[PDB]
Amino acid sequence: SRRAKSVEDDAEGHLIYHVGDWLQERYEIVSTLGEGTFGRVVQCVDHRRGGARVALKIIKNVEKYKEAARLEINVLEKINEKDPDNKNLCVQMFDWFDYHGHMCISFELLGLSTFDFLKDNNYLPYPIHQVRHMAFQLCQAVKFLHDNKLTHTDLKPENILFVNSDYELTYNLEKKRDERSVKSTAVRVVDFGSATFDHEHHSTIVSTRHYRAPEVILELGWSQPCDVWSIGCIIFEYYVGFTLFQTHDNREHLAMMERILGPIPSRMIRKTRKQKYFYRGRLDWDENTSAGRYVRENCKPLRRYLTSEAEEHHQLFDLIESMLEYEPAKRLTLGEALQHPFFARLRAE
Ligand SMILES: Cc1[nH]nc2ccc(-c3cncc(OC[C@@H](N)CC(C)C)c3)cc12
């Protein structure tokens, strides 16, 4: 139990449970796996399914999370309908139910997220062959969503889980050290609480800050392309170990974009209602100030992050660069991404 830090606290609205409790004479609670804003993810034995080990997402008894859960359930039912064998790499839902105001969703049990493995491993970047396979599966799973009129909107390393996050301590002679390496790079995409059908109401602000597309920031409307932007940032992150856009501020974010990617298109600058960020038709950002120095020193043009001159590394950056195109309509689609030369070192299953 932790200390509450404000009136509106994240600790409020959870279902109280203790290890060993059974929910609905069915789900025996084995351990707590994580806590997000929505509630908790718990490991359970499902006793009405041969004792299968499952992940149970127990949602807070708070209306906004209860609403998000209903939308997620609807999205997962679509996923199950269109992908009965659970082949398109989005997490499989088994069952859902209302427990005294707390929505509960049952999923296949999975390992640590691609973020948490990275974090626990000292942010040591994934080797490129792992980046390739992880990125490929990510593009497959989200392409499936894009084919069925869906946009995830909150893609990030925390929402990409290893099927099994077991690792090997392999010997690295170059550094005279031992290093952790995940044995299997099979992944699933999770958390569909923000996933939006083409025809549904679009929230103005979507995505976690680091993964947010420029059309979202400038409020130009967003659809599937904003997922591709997120994927571009995620892939970069797998390759170097740190976020591409380390910021929490629109103006700074947009400045970092310009520094990493070049000037924002005029069409977007003139169209946006966020005129506050612009002066005389260009980003209102003084590079010569202390704020400007920070951006100049802590990020650089995208390609300069290459840690090797080998063609397969350049191919990776061709991929990222195409995903981080400013204009959503010019940005690489996920169907195009799967045909990209970077992935070639894989043969169809
Ligand atoms: C371990 C595991 N096994 N199977 C799972 C199926 C689904 C989920 C999941 C569902 N919705 C949201 C999620 O958030 C991930 C991250 N954003 C916040 C964490 C602190 C929980 C994860 C986890 C699963």
CATH code: domain of residue 104? 3.30.200.20
- Distance in angstroms (rounded) separating the CA atoms of residues 3 and 98: 28
Domain identity same for 139 and 279: yes
Pairing of strands 52-59, 93-99: unpaired
Domain identity same for 35 and 143: no
What one-character DSSP code corresponds to residue 167?
Answer: E
Task: Give bridge partners of residue 52 from the DSSP assignment.
Answer: 46
Within a 13 Å sphere around the CA of 9, how many CA atoms are in the beta-carbon half? 9
Domain identity same for 134 and 271: yes
Query: Is 261:324 a contact under the CB 8 Å cutoff?
Result: yes
Pocket-testing residue among 38, 41, 105, 194, ligand 1, by greatest number of atoms within 8 A of Cβ: 41
And the tokens for 48? 């009405």
Virtual CA dihedral for 75, 111, 51, 40, nearest 10 degrees?
-60
Domain identity same for 77 and 148: no
- Our CA angle for 184, 27, 190, nearest 5°, is 40
- Our CA angle for 192, 336, 79, nearest 5°, is 25
Domain identity same for 30 and 42: yes
Q: Is 158 in the pocket of ligand 1 (CB under 6 A)?
A: yes
Residues annotated in a binding site for ATP: 33-41, 57
And the tokens for 107? 């999923």
Please identify, among 109, 144, 173, the residue that sits at the C-terminal boundary of a domain: 109
Domain identity same for 1 and 114: no
Q: Which residues are CB-neighbours of 169 under 8 A, at least 6 positions away?
A: 178, 179, 180
- Distance in angstroms (rounded) separating the CA atoms of residues 208 and 227: 11
Domain identity same for 148 and 289: yes
Pocket-testing residue among 92, 106, 110, 190, ligand 1, by greatest number of atoms within 8 A of Cβ: 190
- Distance in angstroms (rounded) separating the CA atoms of residues 349 and 347: 7
Domain identity same for 276 and 129: yes
Give burial (CB, 10 Å; 0-12/13-18/19+) of 166. Answer: exposed
CA of 294 to the centre of ligand 1 (A): 34
Which residue, judged by its Cα, is nearest atom 7 of ligand 1?
190
Q: Is 57 in the pocket of ligand 1 (CB under 6 A)?
A: yes
Which residue, judged by its Cα, is nearest atom 12 of ligand 1?
191
> For residue 293, how far is the Cα from the chain centroid?
30
Task: Look up tokens 């609807």; give the residue.
Answer: 74
- Resolution (angstroms) stands at 2.4
Domain identity same for 9 and 156: no
Residue 95: active-site member: no
Domain identity same for 211 and 349: yes
Task: Give bridge partners of residue 104 from the DSSP assignment.
Answer: 58, 97
Domain identity same for 104 and 115: no
Q: Which residues are CB-neighbours of 14 under 8 A, at least 6 positions away?
A: 35, 39, 40, 58, 60
Nearest to residue 155, comparing CAs of 94, 226, 69? 226
Phi/psi for 103 (5° steps) reads -65, 140
Domain boundaries, position 21: 1-86+91-109
Task: Give bridge partners of residue 182 from the DSSP assignment.
Answer: 167
CA of 177 to the centre of ligand 1 (A): 32
Task: Look up tokens 């980046």; give the residue.
Answer: 131
SS3 of 247, please?
coil
Q: Is 90 in the pocket of ligand 1 (CB under 6 A)?
A: no
> Amino acid identity, residue 131?
V
Q: Is 119 in the pocket of ligand 1 (CB under 6 A)?
A: no
SS3 of 345, please?
coil
Name the experiment that determined this structure. X-ray
Atom of ligand 1 minimally distant from the CA of 40: 21
Query: Is 250:205 a contact under the CB 8 Å cutoff?
Result: no
Nearest to residue 220, comparing CAs of 320, 327, 140? 327
Phi/psi for 170 (5° steps) reads -90, 145
Query: Is 342:312 a contact under the CB 8 Å cutoff?
Result: yes
DSSP E strand stretches across 119-259: 150-151, 160-162, 167-172, 177-182, 187-189, 196-197
- Distance in angstroms (rounded) separating the CA atoms of residues 262 and 282: 12
Phi/psi for 81 (5° steps) reads -60, -55
Query: Domains in the chain: how many in total?
Result: 2
Please identify, among 109, 141, 162, the residue that sits at the C-terminal boundary of a domain: 109
- Distance in angstroms (rounded) separating the CA atoms of residues 259 and 290: 15
**Three-class DSSP labels, 42-107:** EEEEECCCCCEEEEEEEECCCHHHHHHHHHHHHHHHHHHHHCCCCCCCECCEEEEEEECCEEEEEE
Which one of 154, 166, 227, 249 is the catalytic residue? 154
Domain identity same for 25 and 173: no
- Distance in angstroms (rounded) separating the CA atoms of residues 205 and 198: 16
Atom of ligand 1 minimally distant from the CA of 41: 21
- Distance in angstroms (rounded) separating the CA atoms of residues 169 and 319: 30
Atom of ligand 1 minimally distant from the CA of 107: 6
- Distance in angstroms (rounded) separating the CA atoms of residues 30 and 9: 26
Nearest to residue 334, comparing CAs of 194, 234, 186, 207? 234
Q: How far is CA 129 from CA 10, 74, 347, in A?
A: 38, 35, 13
